[PDB]
Subunit: 31 residues, 4 copies
């Protein structure tokens, strides 16, 4: 069993999604 | 919508894999 | 002259700082 | 404060250099 593995995936997915929104609109300001 | 989107996507996945490993070690110390 | 170079640094610095706060408190939840 | 901090720092710089290059190309298309 590895809760940290699955658990870590969650938190990581939360950050990746957050960056998307930011970088998304941020990258739009240029183009 | 534009390159700005496809970009933010490449960054997220990049940041995810990065933070993904971090959390792993974070819990490793105490699981 | 390269405004994109210096300009890019700014935006990038804004994201890095943002991630710090997030990852900071996020990494604290573990330890 | 703890490893959680030193970590978030390593991630930021990592995400920065990543987003730093992106912006470069973003403006490259139109500067």
């Amino acid at each position: 069993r590895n809760d940290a593995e699955r658990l870590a995936d969650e938190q990581s997915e939360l950050v990746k999604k957050m960056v998307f929104d930011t970088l998304k609109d941020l990258y739009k300001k240029t183009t």
